[PDB]
Design a protein around this ligand. Structure first.
Ligand SMILES: CN1C[C@H](C(=O)N[C@]2(C)O[C@@]3(O)[C@@H]4CCCN4C(=O)[C@H](Cc4ccccc4)N3C2=O)C[C@@H]2c3cccc4[nH]cc(c34)C[C@H]21
Ligand SMILES: CN1C[C@H](C(=O)N[C@]2(C)O[C@@]3(O)[C@@H]4CCCN4C(=O)[C@H](Cc4ccccc4)N3C2=O)C[C@@H]2c3cccc4[nH]cc(c34)C[C@H]21
Lengths: 367, 367
């Protein structure tokens, strides 16, 4: 029995439009992300090549899997033969696993950048990403290939005969990637909260007291700026390159010390001018590392949203497909919930990553 | 800083005795299980060879890992050099992973027996188990071997440098095996509750009404026995071998029909004798399949307990070692909680499996 055979004509048509609309939006939305990295010179970074490859897999889901899936989800009956059934089931498994595994490659790349910015820079080559993408495609194709034990050839479903493969395929495609991301993103969230916020918070406090400039109240603000500079200095096993970050603050501390010398003497005009002097000369050594932090905070926020979107979309499906061996609409809804992640990913990047956001404003011609 | 350096002399000694006591109990308790399968002729089954191999791995943990671990847990300092450190860490990882993977092999074997008793019998050869044990040892040794990236050589700990291996090792050794067991045991529990209890419950009801044999009350008991026989018949895609199980009940139903013919006529002595006649002749065709169910119910109860013991012992440790990348006593306690599973497994088999329970009563000379 097919539950779809009891659905009314308006609901079946409404569902055909809805599904075709999200398939086309997935095609167009990914096509844009791919085009943007290709078109934009600034975006020719190994990091953006991973975003583009993630968008290629999601474009392949929208072309090879989703349109032919609207036909099957609404009617409930396979009508394209065994050869197209086998190619579609395999292309479903490879593309959806590769989309998930691209996330981990994007999250390992982020992890190594936030964990070893100095050493990782030389290693993070576009040639390295090429191997990581190829490895992801190799691992994904190698998942749909073993369930070809069909020594037999209406309905098109993946072979559930061998329990051990059903669970291995569920591990390699989801549970291994998500446990990796907990461990990976957890570290990223600890680094973004304890360091990419300690530099930014202690700088806010420094600029807030600079904006203040009675002479008595200036002395209390100048000693508040000194404390924030020392707590901002500790953000940053030899010390090369980080000595430059550490120097700017040590100078700002010395400049605050020389300014307070004029403030303690009683001079107000000589001290107020000494504060606006280090204002430009601080934002000459510090704004370099400070701007870096905004880019870090930004890139981890989008990843956080991407990972949240990934868990919400793919956890129900993989929880159900593991429970399945132990209603059909629930399964049809969750496959499309997983398919929806291919549409959610490009919109997250276009709304959170300002390179793609600016890029989008350019094609719609919005200022 | 070592937390152990602040522990008092009586507590350190008390902890040395406690740990040596559980190490020796693990050695002796596994040695017995191994000996029992080796000594007993009846126990020369591929199923019992898995119990014995599971006991070999747990004996290897008690010899190669646990005694040298009491020294380290109580003192908190490694004092046996780098060569013994590397062999001990590797032998820890291989043996503990193999013990866990033996569980899945024991649970796949149970799953295939309860899911395909007829076809699986011919496949379940001791030669098949030899490959499954070798595959488990091959996979386990292959886990401790990659963390040999130590291009460097007080403290003896596993290399945590490469995050991707830490999580892969955590997946291959625990999360993949436990998700497999949920899927495997879930099926076993569904088969044991819906079938190995439907035969047993409908037989209780049949024997309860036979124990009854006023003539009016006999007719209500005889028609209650008929209903239970038809519901017991449905326990059991061609029908060979299962036609023999189905026949016994169909005859019992016919024998109840012939008995009720004497009961409806008004005859009490002719009908009461007809019930005690099918009592022996039923327990000639049915007690064969009925005894099989007790053995099935028994074997799934021990597995349930083993799996429960496995989750309680190994989940905290593997949850912590995945959290670790994102106090040292917590880690020392949970390793020993995992080590304890090597002692819990042989006592579960000796108290739940009646072959080992009888075997134990023989060495202590108890009747
Ligand atoms: C979202 N995708 C849907 C694919 C799917 O479920 N296909 C079928 C045709 O749709 C079903 O869900 C339908 C819905 C109504 C009844 N259905 C089914 O019973 C099965 C369930 C099933 C799920 C997984 C594997 C085998 C069967 N289904 C199928 O086999 C399955 C597909 C998949 C299988 C194995 C590993 C994988 N990695 C990544 C993926 C993936 C993508 C994933
Ligand atoms: C119970 N076993 C204990 C082993 C262990 O934890 N060894 C060390 C020496 O003890 C520690 O737990 C101690 C306790 C006090 C501080 N310790 C540590 O920080 C680490 C933690 C650690 C755990 C896993 C991997 C690497 C480090 N530890 C170690 O490396 C680790 C060991 C293990 C690692 C990887 C895969 C594995 N499969 C099966 C196992 C296994 C068995 C498992």
């Amino acid at each position: 029995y097919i539950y779809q055979d009891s659905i009314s004509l308006p609901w079946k048509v409404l569902l055909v439009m809805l599904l075709a609309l999200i398939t086309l939006a997935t095609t167009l939305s990914n096509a844009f992300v791919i085009a943007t990295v290709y078109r934009t010179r600034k975006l020719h970074t190994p990091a953006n090549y991973l975003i583009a490859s993630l968008a290629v897999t999601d474009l392949l889901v929208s072309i090879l899997v989703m349109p032919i899936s609207t036909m099957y989800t609404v009617t409930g009956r396979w009508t394209l033969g065994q050869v197209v059934c086998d190619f579609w089931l395999s292309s479903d498994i490879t593309c959806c696993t590769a989309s998930i595994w691209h996330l981990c490659v994007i999250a390992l790349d982020r992890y190594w950048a936030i964990t070893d910015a100095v050493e990782y820079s030389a290693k993070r080559t576009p040639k390295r990403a090429a191997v990581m993408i190829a490895l992801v495609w190799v691992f994904s194709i190698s998942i749909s290939l073993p369930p070809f034990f069909w020594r037999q050839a209406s309905e098109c479903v993946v072979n559930t005969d061998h329990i051990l493969y059903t669970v291995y395929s569920t591990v390699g495609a989801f549970y291994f990637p998500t446990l990796l991301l907990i461990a990976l993103y957890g570290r990223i969230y600890v680094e973004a909260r304890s360091r990419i916020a300690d530099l930014e918070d202690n700088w806010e406090t420094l600029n807030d007291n600079l904006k203040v400039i009675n002479a008595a109240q200036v002395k209390d603000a100048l000693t508040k700026m000194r404390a924030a500079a020392l707590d901002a200095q500790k953000a940053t096993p030899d010390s090369p390159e980080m000595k430059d970050f550490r120097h700017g603050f040590d100078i700002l501390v010395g400049q605050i010390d020389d300014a307070l010398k004029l403030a303690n003497e009683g001079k107000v005009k000589e001290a107020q001018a000494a504060a606006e002097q280090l204002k430009t000369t601080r934002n000459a050594y510090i704004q370099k590392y400070l701007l870096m932090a905004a880019r870090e905070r930004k890139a981890t926020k989008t990843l956080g949203i991407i990972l949240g979107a990934f868990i919400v979309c793919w956890l129900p499906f993989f929880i159900i497909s593991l429970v399945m061996p132990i209603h059909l609409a629930i399964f049809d809804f969750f496959t499309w919930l997983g398919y929806l992640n291919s549409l959610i990913n490009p919109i997250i990047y276009t709304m959170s990553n300002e390179d793609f956001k600016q890029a989008f404003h350019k094609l719609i011609r919005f200022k």
